[PDB]
């Protein structure tokens, strides 16, 4: 096998600076017969891969020409200048030489952006919900920037751990913002014994945190 | 247009088979190599092998020997995989692609792939519950899309209309079931003045709920 090693396995690059992916090579890529199938391939979060470089440097059409291919036998490059917001994702050198193909890893294109506060929103369980007997309680925590960040329930202004679920958002490809949601989930009982619920960001960008609290009533 | 359209989501129970397919328009079928791709849950791809369906011959990656069939009807240009022997580990997303022929060097045209979950539990529908607030001039509202399997589950608002402030959570799976977010912000003058309605697709149990946010009383 002709094991692909992509360097770096991330990519933070400002907006507008050039960001360039190595790609090494277990053996030559030069194939029998004179050409080099050493392609590049972009996947953008929830996309399918798509072909941006085919023979180390034809770019495939529809490709803008920010995307150029270099490089020889074992040693590949591939150069973005001039970044935009909707070119992050994930970037993979491919082998079609030698049985079998091979990808390299990913190299994870994130950017860099200013500094941007979470907007915090909290949410009481539906009245659909209440019927069936369970009660979640959502948190949204809203394009903000960098990816650090913390939650803290507080069921009657005690803090509570169990029953807590997370998910976070992959960079967001129009403002450059990283998301959150944090979800309670009790029984409609254990919602009922209780009275006051609040969910607290801490973010780098200040010193308190973002309160958001309703009472059950 | 070159297009290649890939089976729907697939839940299959431990050590069964699947038949993956692959319905190819906009060229000549016969004389272009069909490839397929494995995407597990996280990152990374890797090669399966290759049809050439003119006349069936193919190439395949020694570690999907036992576990990978490629076939192919001509008839009515469709590519075929067949998946055996199913361990929890195959679990995955399998793209199909067009490669090698005239004037084709690379994968240039990859389906939308197929998701294939292999477990024992259940197929089940999603209940989707409104996230209305407890002016700012910028209102989130959300949906919280709760208890459902297998994945995927897509969200889209008022049918595609709002894409901007749109943000889906991946899901988080607790006991054989899989629950996400997904907020909207939209400026305040325009809710509840106006109409916001997600829609939850679950094409796994070919389902699609539209909630419609309405204040609380």
């Known amino acids: 096998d002709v094991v692909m090693t992509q360097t770096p396995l991330s990519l933070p690059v400002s907006l507008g600076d050039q960001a360039s992916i190595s790609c090494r090579s277990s053996?030559?890529?030069?194939?029998?017969?004179?050409?080099?199938?050493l392609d590049w391939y972009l996947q953008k979060p929830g996309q399918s891969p798509k072909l941006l470089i085919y023979?180390?440097?034809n770019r495939f059409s529809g490709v803008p020409d920010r995307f150029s291919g270099s490089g020889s036998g074992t040693d590949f490059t591939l150069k973005i200048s001039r970044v935009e917001a909707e070119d992050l994702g994930v970037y993979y050198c491919?082998?079609?030489?030698?049985?079998?193909?091979?990808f390299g890893s990913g190299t994870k294109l994130e950017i860099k952006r200013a500094d941007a506060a979470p907007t915090v929103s909290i949410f009481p369980p539906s009245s659909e919900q209440l019927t069936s007997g369970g009660a979640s309680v959502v948190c949204f925590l809203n394009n903000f920037y960098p990816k650090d960040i913390n939650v803290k329930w507080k069921i009657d202004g005690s803090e509570r751990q169990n029953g807590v679920l997370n998910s976070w958002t992959d960079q967001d490809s129009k403002d450059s913002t990283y998301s959150m949601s944090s979800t309670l989930t009790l029984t409609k009982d254990e919602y009922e014994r209780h009275n006051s619920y609040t969910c607290e960001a801490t973010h780098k960008t200040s010193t308190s945190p973002i309160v958001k609290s309703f009472n059950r009533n | 247009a070159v297009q290649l359209e890939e089976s729907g989501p697939e839940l299959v129970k431990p050590g069964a088979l699947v038949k993956i397919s692959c319905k190819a328009s906009?060229?000549?079928?016969?004389?272009?190599?069909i490839n397929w791709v494995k995407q597990r849950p996280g990152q990374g791809l890797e090669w399966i092998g290759w049809?050439?369906?003119?006349?069936?011959?193919?190439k395949y990656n020694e570690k999907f020997k036992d576990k990978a069939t490629l076939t192919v009807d001509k008839s009515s240009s469709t590519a075929y995989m067949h998946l055996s022997s199913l361990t929890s580990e195959n679990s995955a997303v399998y793209f199909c692609?067009?490669?090698?022929?005239?004037?084709?060097?690379?994968?240039?045209?990859w389906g939308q792939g197929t998701s294939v979950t292999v477990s024992s539990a259940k197929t089940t529908p999603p209940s989707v519950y409104p996230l209305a607030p407890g002016t700012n001039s910028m209102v989130t509202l959300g949906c919280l899309v709760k208890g459902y399997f297998p994945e995927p589950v897509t969200v889209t608002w008022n049918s595609g209309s709002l894409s901007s402030g749109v943000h889906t959570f991946p899901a988080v799976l607790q006991s054989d079931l899989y629950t996400l977010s997904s907020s909207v912000t939209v400026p305040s003058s325009t809710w509840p003045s106006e109409t916001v309605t997600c829609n939850v697709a679950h094409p796994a149990s070919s389902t699609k709920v539209d909630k419609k946010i309405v204040p609380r009383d």
């Open positions: 906009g060229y000549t079928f016969t004389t272009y190599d």
């Open positions: 049809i050439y369906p003119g006349d069936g011959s193919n």
């Open positions: 023979k180390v440097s």
């Open positions: 692609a067009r490669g090698y022929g005239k004037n084709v060097y690379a994968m240039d045209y």
């Open positions: 053996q030559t890529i030069v194939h029998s017969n004179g050409y080099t199938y």
């Open positions: 491919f082998q079609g030489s030698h049985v079998p193909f091979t």
